[PDB]
Nucleic acid binder design. Structure first.
Ligand SMILES: [Mg+2]
Ligand SMILES: [Mg+2]
Ligand SMILES: [Mg+2]
Ligand SMILES: [Mg+2]
Ligand SMILES: [Mg+2]
Ligand SMILES: [Mg+2]
Ligand SMILES: [Mg+2]
Ligand SMILES: [Mg+2]
Ligand SMILES: [Mg+2]
Ligand SMILES: [Mg+2]
Ligand SMILES: [Mg+2]
Ligand SMILES: [Mg+2]
Ligand SMILES: [Mg+2]
Ligand SMILES: [Mg+2]
Ligand SMILES: [Mg+2]
Ligand SMILES: [Mg+2]
Ligand SMILES: [Mg+2]
Ligand SMILES: [Mg+2]
Ligand SMILES: [Mg+2]
Ligand SMILES: [Mg+2]
Ligand SMILES: [Mg+2]
Ligand SMILES: [Mg+2]
Ligand SMILES: [Mg+2]
Ligand SMILES: [Mg+2]
Ligand SMILES: [Mg+2]
Ligand SMILES: [Mg+2]
Ligand SMILES: [Mg+2]
Ligand SMILES: [Mg+2]
Ligand SMILES: [Mg+2]
Ligand SMILES: [Mg+2]
Ligand SMILES: [Mg+2]
Ligand SMILES: [Mg+2]
Ligand SMILES: [Mg+2]
Ligand SMILES: [Mg+2]
Ligand SMILES: [Mg+2]
Ligand SMILES: [Mg+2]
Ligand SMILES: [Mg+2]
Ligand SMILES: [Mg+2]
Ligand SMILES: [Mg+2]
Ligand SMILES: [Mg+2]
Ligand SMILES: [Mg+2]
Ligand SMILES: [Mg+2]
Ligand SMILES: [Mg+2]
Ligand SMILES: [Mg+2]
Ligand SMILES: [Mg+2]
Ligand SMILES: [Mg+2]
Ligand SMILES: [Mg+2]
Ligand SMILES: [Mg+2]
Ligand SMILES: [Mg+2]
Ligand SMILES: [Mg+2]
Ligand SMILES: [Mg+2]
Ligand SMILES: [Mg+2]
Ligand SMILES: [Mg+2]
Ligand SMILES: [Mg+2]
Ligand SMILES: [Mg+2]
Ligand SMILES: [Mg+2]
Ligand SMILES: [Mg+2]
Ligand SMILES: [Mg+2]
Ligand SMILES: [Mg+2]
Ligand SMILES: [Mg+2]
Ligand SMILES: [Mg+2]
Ligand SMILES: [Mg+2]
Ligand SMILES: [Mg+2]
Ligand SMILES: [Mg+2]
Ligand SMILES: [Mg+2]
Ligand SMILES: [Mg+2]
Ligand SMILES: [Mg+2]
Ligand SMILES: [Mg+2]
Ligand SMILES: [Mg+2]
Ligand SMILES: [Mg+2]
Ligand SMILES: [Mg+2]
Ligand SMILES: [Mg+2]
Ligand SMILES: [Mg+2]
Ligand SMILES: [Mg+2]
Ligand SMILES: [Mg+2]
Ligand SMILES: [Mg+2]
Ligand SMILES: [Mg+2]
Ligand SMILES: [Mg+2]
Ligand SMILES: [Mg+2]
Ligand SMILES: [Mg+2]
Ligand SMILES: [Mg+2]
Ligand SMILES: [Mg+2]
Ligand SMILES: [Mg+2]
Ligand SMILES: [Mg+2]
Ligand SMILES: [Mg+2]
Ligand SMILES: [Mg+2]
Lengths: 97, 44, 76, 63
RNA sequence: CCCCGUGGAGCUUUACUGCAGCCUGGUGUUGGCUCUUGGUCGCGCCGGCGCGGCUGGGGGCCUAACCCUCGGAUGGGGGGACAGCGCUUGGCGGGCAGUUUGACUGGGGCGGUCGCCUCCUAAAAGGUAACGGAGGCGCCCAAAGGUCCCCUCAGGCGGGACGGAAAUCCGCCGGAGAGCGCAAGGGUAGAAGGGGGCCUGACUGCGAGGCCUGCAAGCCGAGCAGGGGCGAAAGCCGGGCCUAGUGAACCGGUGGU
RNA sequence: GUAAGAGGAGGUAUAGGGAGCGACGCUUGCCCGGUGCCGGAAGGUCAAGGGGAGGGGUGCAAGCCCCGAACCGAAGCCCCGG
RNA sequence: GGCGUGCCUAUUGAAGCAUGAGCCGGCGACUCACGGUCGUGGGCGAGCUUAAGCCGUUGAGGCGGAGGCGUAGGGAAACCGAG
RNA sequence: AGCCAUGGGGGAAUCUGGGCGGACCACCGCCUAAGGCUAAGUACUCCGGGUGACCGAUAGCGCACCAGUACCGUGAGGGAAA
RNA sequence: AACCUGGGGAACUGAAACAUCUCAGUACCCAGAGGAGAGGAAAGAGAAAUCGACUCCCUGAGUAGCGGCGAGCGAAAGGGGA
């Protein structure tokens, strides 16, 4: 009826810019606890091919759970998850060119 | 009056209020910056 | 006229009473001056606000000449 | 037909993974001058809303 | 009729903002010759003379654009690079257009008021209304702040060269009736008051826990860390006895990582 | 009326447009500070534009690109008078 | 003989000297679409689900994973990640 | 504040040409303006037909009936009943 | 009849006033096209050394952005199809 409760205030620094969104490689967090879910050679192709990736340009394995000894390719790992599995199997890193 | 203190040989301000004609043309009180600690503060 | 003017109510008084448990920091009493005084485990601040300095029960001392004090008698 | 998100709110309020609504504290952009270090230090952080918090969420929608 | 509605419409103007119109600079339409002041580059010549492109301004004359006109004219005459028209510049602009022109209110208008602090009203928690009764605020201070140390008032009576109703001084009584920047209040000398010495914590990073509260806001705050200040030290310092001295958000200014 | 054009007028200051007053008689005083209008080749401010000292971005460079002081620039307003 | 102030509306208050209505019949007012959010009946489950469309049928369904929601948050961001 | 388009002013080059990739510059890369044409997939429903958890004469089209009629309006136009 | 394209083009209304903004390039007026009309073989996309005319549906997406950053408005590339 009055001055709204948008007395609050844009922090969202970087709201926009005429041509707007800047294309740039985004990473999909996937835990190696949902990795235990199988055995073979886990790769971006696979995690999205069925489950928990979904076209999110970049795979990043990380975090909770216990690492099944196996190869696991991805675009990036957790300082923590690199360990988890590096202490029981192969960590192969992303593409380059 | 609007008075904004400044750090020597650096960059850091402070909340202040100088007085108009009142005896106060230059101020030189100490304080405590973020980078390192404690350094003389001139007006400007 | 030239009247009908006033300042909003300041809601001051004894906030905790004798024999209430209280945590640290609890405002004990809000006051116009030193209508009360600090004492045992009870600090006071710019406005004269008195407040617990450790959890425990509150009690009120009258001391005539010396004035009235408030304390927390701690325990745990 | 498809409510449109309220950009004004998007631009100034997050809805937290549990369900809270966070905002930057008002009062820290020019009333400013001499206000305790405490004063404007305290203004530095986010808070949590309440009943309008629900009002708030209603807009941020496909969001 | 009267009031009310963030209703309508006609009218007004030195309400606001446009629009027509009108004034205007540059420029396109837009050309020739000539005189003279300023610039411009090369040369001849000791800042100045001579020359051409470029010129900018100003004067004059031309005619063929453009305009008017003449017993119809591929022409004569008059005006003439102006005017007119195109784009653009700034102006004036109720001729016209869209609108704005607050609320409270013992009806509305007029008057008064509108946020903040103090007291009363307020019924011994808190909170309470009225166009109820009364007063303040929109600041001030680098010393009026920190800390260490030291001292304690106003007033009444007696006494003292000027002066005594009241300066300054000695005495005796004098618990607070002084002071505490400013209103009022609550507080207060077992200082928060007066004076000193050193000083700048009118710090950065934070913040357990509460007061208050519809929301947003306001308020208090131990303690942790960093690096400091005064103190022998216990300790005290995150401005000022406290409670007013103010303004969401947007948009923008300055400086930084 | 956007325009072409028309009305004015197939008129020409003894005319035409606007304004106010309103046969006729006698008369119509003072005040230009404000407002309007009229005049004022000075001055003051004043837009585009011209100008380019000076500064910038980038490139290895030749460059390209941008910012910009003085100074020249109408009407209007100011100013001066009726 | 006892008792007894129409109906609706609107109101602090209406039999009210407040509103509406001559009477009867018929017409007459909380819908749908998309998207939200709770709840509820059910299918599946770290998964769940298809849109256009294609094929079928001519009151028959099936195919179709593009895509969406979920499986990680925090920060303005770079980024880091059970923090 | 680029790109596309263009009312005003200035005004090129012909592949060592030009344009674009969001001011600008350098790099890298994309495309070839200032001539034109091109089916299908798409839109609609006066018309014909088929179907309806569509109406059943105050409904359904305004019109099941001789209705855009009667009647009403200068007219645009309104517009039944049955 | 409606559909379509080009030229022109409102206001109520929303913003709880209103002027930017919205309504909306909608209503309508005008010219033209036709069984459709438009568009159409890159001086394209935009970040992949990728795509490969145009139109239509699904999606992308109420995202990117636009905005008195109010009210609101609101793409594209890509992917699935015709
Ligand atoms: Mg208001
Ligand atoms: Mg009152
Ligand atoms: Mg303290
Ligand atoms: Mg204090
Ligand atoms: Mg303090
Ligand atoms: Mg959940
Ligand atoms: Mg900070
Ligand atoms: Mg979404
Ligand atoms: Mg109102
Ligand atoms: Mg009104
Ligand atoms: Mg000359
Ligand atoms: Mg000239
Ligand atoms: Mg000349
Ligand atoms: Mg001549
Ligand atoms: Mg001639
Ligand atoms: Mg001549
Ligand atoms: Mg001829
Ligand atoms: Mg002549
Ligand atoms: Mg309007
Ligand atoms: Mg009123
Ligand atoms: Mg009255
Ligand atoms: Mg008044
Ligand atoms: Mg009271
Ligand atoms: Mg009381
Ligand atoms: Mg209370
Ligand atoms: Mg009450
Ligand atoms: Mg002093
Ligand atoms: Mg003093
Ligand atoms: Mg005496
Ligand atoms: Mg001191
Ligand atoms: Mg807290
Ligand atoms: Mg707290
Ligand atoms: Mg503390
Ligand atoms: Mg310390
Ligand atoms: Mg130290
Ligand atoms: Mg202390
Ligand atoms: Mg003091
Ligand atoms: Mg605003
Ligand atoms: Mg703004
Ligand atoms: Mg500014
Ligand atoms: Mg004529
Ligand atoms: Mg004529
Ligand atoms: Mg004539
Ligand atoms: Mg005549
Ligand atoms: Mg006479
Ligand atoms: Mg006269
Ligand atoms: Mg002169
Ligand atoms: Mg230079
Ligand atoms: Mg350089
Ligand atoms: Mg260089
Ligand atoms: Mg050079
Ligand atoms: Mg010059
Ligand atoms: Mg001039
Ligand atoms: Mg002039
Ligand atoms: Mg009756
Ligand atoms: Mg009645
Ligand atoms: Mg009535
Ligand atoms: Mg009836
Ligand atoms: Mg009646
Ligand atoms: Mg629904
Ligand atoms: Mg470009
Ligand atoms: Mg052009
Ligand atoms: Mg680029
Ligand atoms: Mg290059
Ligand atoms: Mg048919
Ligand atoms: Mg049919
Ligand atoms: Mg019928
Ligand atoms: Mg019948
Ligand atoms: Mg029929
Ligand atoms: Mg008739
Ligand atoms: Mg259409
Ligand atoms: Mg409106
Ligand atoms: Mg409204
Ligand atoms: Mg409305
Ligand atoms: Mg059109
Ligand atoms: Mg045809
Ligand atoms: Mg066809
Ligand atoms: Mg065709
Ligand atoms: Mg064509
Ligand atoms: Mg071609
Ligand atoms: Mg093309
Ligand atoms: Mg290829
Ligand atoms: Mg606003
Ligand atoms: Mg739009
Ligand atoms: Mg098909
Ligand atoms: Mg189809």
């Amino acid at each position: 009826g009055r001055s709204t409760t948008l007395m609050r205030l844009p922090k969202r620094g970087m709201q926009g810019q005429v041509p707007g969104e800047i294309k740039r490689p985004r990473y999909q967090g996937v835990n190696l606890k949902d990795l235990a879910r199988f055995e073979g050679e886990v790769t971006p192709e696979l995690l999205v091919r069925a489950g928990l990736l979904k076209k999110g340009y970049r795979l990043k394995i990380l975090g909770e759970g216990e690492a099944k000894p196996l190869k696991v390719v991805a675009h990036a790992f957790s300082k923590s998850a690199l360990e988890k599995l590096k202490a029981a199997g192969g960590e192969p890193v992303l593409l380059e060119a | 009056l609007l008075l904004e203190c400044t750090e020597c040989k650096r960059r850091n301000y402070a909340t202040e209020k100088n007085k108009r004609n009142t005896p106060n043309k230059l101020e030189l009180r100490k304080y405590c910056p973020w980078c390192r600690k404690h350094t003389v503060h001139r007006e400007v | 006229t030239k009247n009908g003017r006033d300042s909003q109510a300041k809601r001051l008084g004894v906030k905790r009473y004798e024999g209430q448990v209280v945590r640290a920091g609890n405002i004990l009493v809000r006051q116009r001056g030193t209508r009360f005084k600090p004492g045992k485990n009870v600090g006071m601040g710019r406005d004269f606000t008195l407040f617990a300095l450790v959890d425990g029960v509150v009690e009120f001392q009258d001391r005539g000449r010396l004035g009235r004090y408030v304390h927390v008698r701690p325990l745990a | 037909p498809k409510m449109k998100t309220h950009k004004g709110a998007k631009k100034r309020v997050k809805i937290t993974a549990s369900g809270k609504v966070v905002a930057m504290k008002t009062g820290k952009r020019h009333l400013n001058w001499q206000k305790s270090g405490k004063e404007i230090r305290q203004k530095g952080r986010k808070f949590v809303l309440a009943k309008p918090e629900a009002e708030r969420i209603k807009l941020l929608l496909p969001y």
